[PDB]
Design a protein around this nucleic acid. Structure first.
Ligand SMILES: [Mg+2]
Ligand SMILES: [Zn+2]
Ligand SMILES: [Zn+2]
Ligand SMILES: [Zn+2]
Ligand SMILES: [Zn+2]
Lengths: 51, 66, 113, 51, 1157, 45
RNA sequence: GUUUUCGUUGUUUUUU
């Protein structure tokens, strides 16, 4: 294997090979106190859904 | 064949773990704890290593032209 | 063999501008702003920032097509402030917010590790 | 020159995916922002491989 | 000994495949071919006599040639320059050769002038690539490592001219069985008792006979019976042929027919037959009667007429029973009973004979097919010796005898049958079967394996019917019930089951001895009064004995087949109700290994398995504790082979649960038979696994039993065309198409038969992340939304390879074209493509970035007469790009350089690309979105792909949900999950474990809108699934044509996306346009977009009979001398063609530009 | 210039339009056009 | 040198 390589400045937007991150976790309202998700449930909403 | 350089679902540096993964395998070790040892936290990264199929060993055991 | 290109998502062509404002006489003190080379990231931010402005009477944006990194934003303000001026105000406000964000982050990063 | 049993597109794309230590990538000029013909170091870091 | 669990059954199947495998039937078939079949076909007439009766005083100068032993040689390809080498299959593929070996015979001579050894080359036989005489048979893997063969590539095919052709086995009805059918009412025939009476050995057709019943009820006079014997020109009454066949009195005819003498209706119904045959009262008149209608020549007179009638009653009448003398009494008894069965079926006292039950059908493998073709070709081999030893016998020369043997006799029939596909001779192109041999597919690895285990029913659409296409209960566990082709061939072209094996053909004589061991009562003894309730015994369909105590003999035969003295595959069936018994050893009857539940109620093992954990442990050893192989289990009487005809007479347990006859409220379990009235059940057998009713493809699907059967069939169909990795040495193969995945991934959901399939080692598909919602609105209507990050990282990236084959040709003997760089001077009629890529020998270098409109293989061809050379190059395909993978330079068989250039391309998914799941879930890409725009999880995790929820209400794939759930669980826990059908897994437990995984039991999880980060109100079911790339892309169908090449004859746009084809405008499109009022639009579609020529026709005759010249401006109607009354017509060229053939058929279609009125 | 390589004997060589297809030393008629030493450039993405 | 030159029979498998 004999290879030469050219690296140029880039961003994740143009390729995941320049991606600075794999995934970024973003959260808020850790109890759904703002009512942004339904807590879909078969029996009950608070207990079916974890903390 | 050949584990991806970057994790398809996530994008984590994963390539430099295969030999380490085999090392962990050799000692009759469970799979999941070994993957956790490999810093495989996201189950996407986890099954990417768990379910990767490398195939070059049969290809390489062919005697090449040179 | 027909799909579009990737660097154009932010590279400005000569003929079209980054910012094309046209008067929206539909309601008084309203304009329509075409941001080429843009997407939800800046659009939603500016939309919320303008919505927080009391002068801003109408604020909305739309990415007319997801297959093109561009969007258009309709902005009406009260009879006092112009839509464009509200836009510079929103941009500068988010500037100062980002400054404070970066400063606090850096300080507590340093004290943390 | 390559005498392996793998496609060169394979290894090339994989090499692109490889992150490079880039604490100063900001100073690097873009391949389109930099005015030079072909590549210069300022907009292009050269890598090499021989095995 | 203990209970039998599922893993023990898996171990049993491991023994099964370690001895048999899945090619064992083909291997043993082709080995039987060149170990018993070939020799018998050679010696089926071992006597060749000539003579010169005259003088030499008087003499019989007897040239007499006796046949002898055949010879088999190891493959040697004999280069065209005397540099003979032993041939290797790799070289055969590289140089486009045939995997064929030379054969030789000993046709010795014996000269007998009366007063009154030699080794010739018969021919070259193509060989199946894993027979015992294959070049690489004894050679070990390291030797294989030197000859570059894929270890998973498992042979079973034939190599001819570098093309791999497989002989598809053909299913046909088993012969020598009574077939009574209900003839149509508006016909003199009511019931047709048919039997294809043909020699059991060889399984080849000799003759057949159909006895037709005349008359109606209160209509059509008496119930007379007159059948047309083979090669007779009239329906002769059956009582008459009984007179002719030896039994002239009618009471003998009834003793042959009547066997329930308590019945009066059949007596009074056969009375009219006696009345009509009463004109015949002896054997002489009956035989003359037959001979008159016997289609023989005229002038044969009564004596030879009777002799020929007797012969045709002897030969070609029940030939499977006998063709020689002495058994014409057996002929009388058999015909009498067959007529009796006809009459009983006519009375409807028995259900009419079924036409699909496999017990009356066999499968002709490659073995007997090649046997039949060799029979044909050799029957045209033995005769050209006669037709040359006559032109030389008159000269009585010192004949070389090595020039009358045209050895290529058996080369060309096989070459044409295996190459073109027609099993016969090219001269007899008509009435030939097409498709029995086809090119082996290596698109994927299964595209070979499953391809090697097809079956086909070559009936034809002559009468459409659903019975050849409809699944039947007898197909249970014997065939795959989901693998079927599309519309034209759907239902037909059927696959085996997983554990099936085909009878390779054992001598029937051992079975004859086993049966006669029990005091058989001859057919002559069979009497209506004596044998009022005795058991009629049949072999292979031939009725060969009677018995009154059949229980002992059937028990002994069953236990003996359990032992092994009887060939373990030989079918034993006991028709208790109809006082009959039948043994089948003919080739083509397919058997499944059933666990032997003790059926004789004499122990607790009755209702349990003879095979126990002792046998399981012995198999787990792989050997015997003093070998225990699969044949060990089969011959130990704990597992036995069973056919469908046996299956319908046996009662089988499904799972190890219902073996012992048994004596709550769970919504995650299946159902066994209720056992409410039938308090007892003595299941004589149990399947090794119900999941073995599946097929090779069906052993792939995760829980195929939780999804709709139509979707299961769609899965089966799409599985063979799904992208993957076919062979390890794909590179050394120069194939039309090769597809290799960048990153093969073993499925998270797995079967256990998977383990046997080695799907970890050749996996087809990847485990990618999917979430269910309607986020983009583009997911509708079979479209999916893709993560661009995974694509950039290379998810489902792949490699495609295309091999172009080129060769120099011989116009004469020395007139040859050459591979050279075309130029503007030496080469005429050049092409706009760039020739520069060619360097010295018209061959591009390996590794160059090739594209379309660029010549890759340059060729120059002589012009028939200084500047007499034409471009004959074959450039790369126009809309194809890539880099040359490989360039192979060799020669042909004799002397011309043959080049194989494989080009390599990287394929990446794009909007519109086709994909499918393992649950029939098929669609194209609708739009691709980047990471930032799609919503993320609480941990910020996005899926790789997004699907349409609307599939679930419509397509209803519960198994897909189970697969995704198990996939999440396995990925979190880090192990391979099992999805074997008919197992005890429960979804609720998996949900509980997901709770243990710290994740929502039903798989829901909050997504946060990618554009806003806002918590999407619903919690999204989001996790991994195993999907597969499919052969169909978007850019291979994109094709626009404003103007291109036109067909040479039609002067209209060509058809085919390859050659810039135009859109064929269907007639319904014309009709809808007419209903749309599209006059001008359709006109220009037929005028400017289609053929349009202008002509000059006459105004007097009104024909195109006008010499026309625009430049001369002369238009003379030679028909009518018309020059001024000539009119120009701009009409489609197809109209000109129509007018042309109308003229050519002496029809005068006088076009008129006016109105007669 | 136009170089050629043998099947598995690893013989490297060069035929012209004067000789038949025959690996000069091994006597192997399955020969292969030796790859071009010329560089090929890729996009690594 | 504007311009500028490929086809069919038969066979198999296919595609909502
Ligand atoms: Mg369609
Ligand atoms: Zn991951
Ligand atoms: Zn530069
Ligand atoms: Zn005329
Ligand atoms: Zn050599």
């Amino acid at each position: 294997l004999n290879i030469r390589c050219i690296a140029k400045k880039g961003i994740a937007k143009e390729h995941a090979k320049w991606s600075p991150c794999s995934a970024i976790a973003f959260e808020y309202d850790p109890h759904n106190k703002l009512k942004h998700t339904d807590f879909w449930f078969e029996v009950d909403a608070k207990k079916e859904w974890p903390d | 064949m050949i584990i991806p350089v970057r994790c398809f679902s996530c994008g984590k540096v994963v390539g430099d773990k295969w030999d380490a993964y085999l090392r962990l395998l050799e000692e009759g070790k469970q799979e999941g704890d070994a993957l956790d040892e490999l810093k495989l936290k996201r189950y996407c990264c986890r099954r990417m290593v768990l379910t990767h199929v490398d195939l070059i060993e049969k290809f390489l055991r062919y005697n090449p032209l040179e | 063999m027909n799909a579009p290109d990737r660097f154009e998502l932010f590279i400005l062509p000569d003929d079209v501008p980054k910012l094309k404002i046209t008067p929206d006489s539909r309601v008084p003190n309203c304009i329509i702003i075409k941001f080429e080379r843009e997407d939800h990231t800046l659009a939603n931010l500016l939309r919320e920032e303008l919505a927080l402005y009391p002068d801003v009477t109408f604020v909305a944006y739309k990415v007319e097509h997801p297959l093109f990194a561009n969007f258009v934003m309709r902005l009406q303000t009260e009879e006092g402030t112009r839509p464009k001026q509200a836009l510079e105000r929103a941009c500068a406000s988010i500037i100062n917010k980002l400054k404070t964000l970066d400063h606090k982050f850096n300080e507590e990063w340093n004290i943390k590790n | 020159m390559n005498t392996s049993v793998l496609a060169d597109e394979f290894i090339s794309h994989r090499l692109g995916l490889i992150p490079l230590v880039s604490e100063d990538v900001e100073e690097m000029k873009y391949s389109r922002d930099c005015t030079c013909e072909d590549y210069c170091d300022e907009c292009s870091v050269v890598l090499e491989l021989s095995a | 000994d203990d209970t039998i669990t599922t893993e023990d059954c898996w171990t049993v199947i491991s023994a099964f495949f370690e001895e048999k495998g899945l090619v064992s039937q083909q291997l043993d078939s082709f080995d039987e071919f060149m170990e018993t079949s070939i020799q018998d076909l050679v010696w089926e007439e071992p006597r060749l006599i000539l003579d010169q009766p005259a003088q030499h005083d008087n003499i019989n100068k007897r040239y007499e040639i006796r046949f002898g032993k055949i010879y088999l040689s190891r493959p040697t390809m004999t280069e065209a320059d005397g540099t003979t080498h032993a041939m290797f299959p790799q070289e055969a593929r590289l140089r486009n050769l045939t995997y064929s070996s030379p054969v030789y015979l000993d046709m010795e001579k014996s000269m007998f002038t009366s007063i009154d050894g030699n080794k010739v080359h018969i021919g070259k036989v193509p060989i199946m690539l894993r027979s015992k005489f294959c070049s690489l048979r004894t050679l070990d893997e390291v030797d294989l490592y030197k000859m570059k063969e894929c270890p998973y590539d498992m042979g079973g095919y034939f190599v001819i001219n570098g093309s791999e052709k497989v002989l598809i086995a053909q299913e046909r009805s088993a012969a020598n069985i009574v077939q009574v059918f209900k003839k149509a009412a508006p016909s003199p025939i009511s019931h047709v008792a048919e039997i294809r009476s043909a020699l059991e050995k060889g399984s080849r057709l000799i003759s057949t006979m159909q006895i037709k019943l005349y008359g109606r009820e209160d209509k059509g006079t008496g119930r007379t019976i007159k059948a047309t014997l083979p090669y007779v020109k009239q329906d002769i009454p059956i009582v008459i042929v009984f007179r002719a066949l030896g039994v002239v009195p009618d009471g003998e005819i009834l003793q042959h027919i009547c066997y329930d003498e308590n019945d009066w209706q059949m007596l009074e119904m056969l009375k009219p037959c006696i009345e009509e045959g009463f004109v015949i009262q002896d054997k002489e008149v009956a035989l003359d009667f037959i001979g008159r209608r016997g289609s023989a020549a005229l002038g044969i007179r009564r004596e030879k007429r009777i002799q020929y009638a007797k012969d045709i009653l002897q030969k070609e009448l029940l030939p499977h029973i006998t063709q020689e003398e002495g058994f014409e009494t057996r002929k009388t008894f058999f015909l009498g009973y067959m007529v009796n069965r006809l009459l009983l079926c006519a009375l409807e006292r028995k259900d009419q004979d079924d036409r699909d039950h496999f017990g009356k059908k066999r499968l002709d493998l490659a073995g007997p097919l090649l046997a039949n073709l060799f029979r044909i070709l050799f029957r045209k081999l033995t005769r050209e010796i006669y037709r040359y030893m006559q032109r030389c016998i008159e000269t009585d020369r010192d004949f070389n005898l090595n020039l009358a043997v045209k050895s290529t006799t058996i080369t060309s029939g096989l070459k044409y049958s295996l190459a073109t596909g027609n099993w016969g001779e090219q001269k007899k192109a008509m009435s030939s079967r097409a498709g029995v041999s086809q090119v082996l597919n290596r698109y994927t690895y299964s595209s070979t394996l499953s391809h090697l285990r097809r079956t086909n029913t070559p009936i034809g659409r002559d009468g459409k019917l659903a019975k050849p296409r409809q699944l039947h209960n007898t197909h249970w566990g014997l065939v795959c019930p989901a693998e079927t082709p599309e519309g034209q061939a759907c239902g037909l072209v059927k696959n085996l089951s997983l554990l099936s094996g085909i009878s390779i053909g054992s001598p029937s004589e051992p079975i004859i001895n086993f049966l006669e061991e029990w005091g058989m009562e001859p057919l002559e003894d069979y009497d209506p009064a004596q044998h009022t309730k005795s058991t009629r015994i049949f072999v292979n369909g031939v009725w060969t004995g009677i018995h009154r105590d059949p229980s002992m003999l059937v028990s002994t035969m069953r236990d003996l087949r359990r032992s092994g003295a009887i060939s373990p595959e030989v079918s034993i069936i006991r028709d208790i109700r109809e006082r009959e018994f039948k043994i089948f050893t003919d080739v083509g009857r397919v058997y499944r290994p059933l666990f032997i539940v003790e059926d004789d109620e004499s122990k607790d093992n009755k209702g349990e398995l003879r095979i126990t954990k002792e046998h399981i442990r012995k198999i787990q050893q792989g050997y015997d504790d003093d070998v225990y192989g699969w044949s060990s289990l089969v011959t130990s009487g704990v597992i036995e082979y069973v056919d469908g005809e046996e299956e319908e007479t046996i009662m089988i347990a499904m799972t190890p649960e219902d073996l012992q006859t048994r004596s709550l409220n769970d919504t995650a379990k299946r159902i066994k038979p209720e056992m409410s009235t039938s308090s007892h059940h003595t299941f004589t057998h149990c399947e090794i696994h119900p999941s073995m009713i599946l097929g090779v493809a069906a052993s792939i699907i995760p829980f195929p039993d939780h999804n709709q059967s139509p979707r299961n069939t769609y899965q089966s169909a799409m599985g063979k065309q799904a992208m993957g990795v076919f062979l390890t040495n794909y590179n050394v193969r120069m194939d039309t198409m090769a597809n290799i995945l960048y990153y093969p991934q073993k499925p998270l959901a797995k079967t256990q038969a998977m383990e046997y399939l080695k799907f970890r080692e050749l996996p087809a598909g990847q485990n990618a992340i999917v979430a269910i919602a309607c986020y983009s609105g583009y997911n509708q209507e079979d479209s999916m939304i893709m993560n661009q990050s995974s694509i950039d990282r290379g998810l489902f990236r792949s490699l495609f390879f295309r091999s172009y084959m080129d060769q120099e040709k011989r116009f004469g003997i020395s007139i040859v074209e050459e591979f050279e760089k075309p130029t503007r001077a030496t080469t005429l009629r050049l092409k706009h493509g760039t020739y520069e890529k060619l360097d010295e020998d018209g061959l591009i270098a390996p590794g160059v970035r090739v594209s379309g409109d660029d010549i890759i293989i340059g060729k120059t061809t002589p012009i028939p007469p200084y500047h007499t050379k034409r471009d004959a190059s074959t450039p790369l395909r126009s809309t194809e790009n890539g880099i040359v993978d490989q360039v192979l330079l060799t020669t042909n068989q004799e002397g011309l350089k043959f080049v194989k250039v494989r080009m390599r391309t990287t394929k990446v998914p794009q909007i519109g690309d086709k994909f499918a799941s393992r649950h029939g879930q098929k669609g194209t890409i609708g739009v691709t979105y980047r990471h930032e725009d799609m919503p993320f999880s609480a941990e910020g995790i996005v899926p790789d792909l997004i699907i349409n929820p609307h599939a679930i209400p419509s397509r209803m794939t519960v198994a897909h949900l189970i697969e995704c759930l198990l996939s999440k669980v396995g990925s979190i826990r880090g192990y391979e999950g099992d999805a074997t059908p008919f197992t005890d897994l429960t979804v609720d437990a998996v949900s509980n474990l997901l709770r243990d995984n710290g994740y929502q039991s039903r798989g829901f999880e909050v997504m946060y809108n990618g554009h806003t980060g806002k918590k999407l109100m619903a919690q999204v079911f989001f996790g991994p699934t195993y999907y597969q790339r499919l052969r169909h892309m978007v850019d291979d169908k994109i094709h626009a044509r404003a103007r291109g090449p036109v067909q040479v004859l039609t002067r209209q746009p060509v058809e085919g996306r390859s050659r810039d084809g135009g859109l064929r405008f269907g007639e319904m499109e014309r009709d809808c346009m007419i209903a749309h009022g599209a006059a001008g639009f359709l006109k220009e579609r037929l005028m400017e977009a289609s053929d349009a020529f202008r002509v000059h026709v006459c105004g007097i005759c009104g024909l195109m009979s006008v010499i026309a010249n625009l430049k001369k401006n002369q238009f003379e109607c030679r028909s009518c001398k018309n020059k001024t009354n000539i009119y120009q017509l701009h009409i489609p060229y197809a109209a000109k063609l129509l007018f042309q053939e109308l003229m050519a058929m002496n029809i005068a279609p006088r076009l008129y530009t006016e109105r007669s009125g | 210039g136009v170089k050629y390589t043998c099947g598995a004997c690893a013989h490297n060589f060069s035929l012209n339009k004067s000789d038949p297809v025959r690996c000069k030393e091994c006597g192997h008629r399955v020969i292969y056009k030796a790859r071009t030493k010329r560089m090929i450039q890729f996009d690594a993405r």
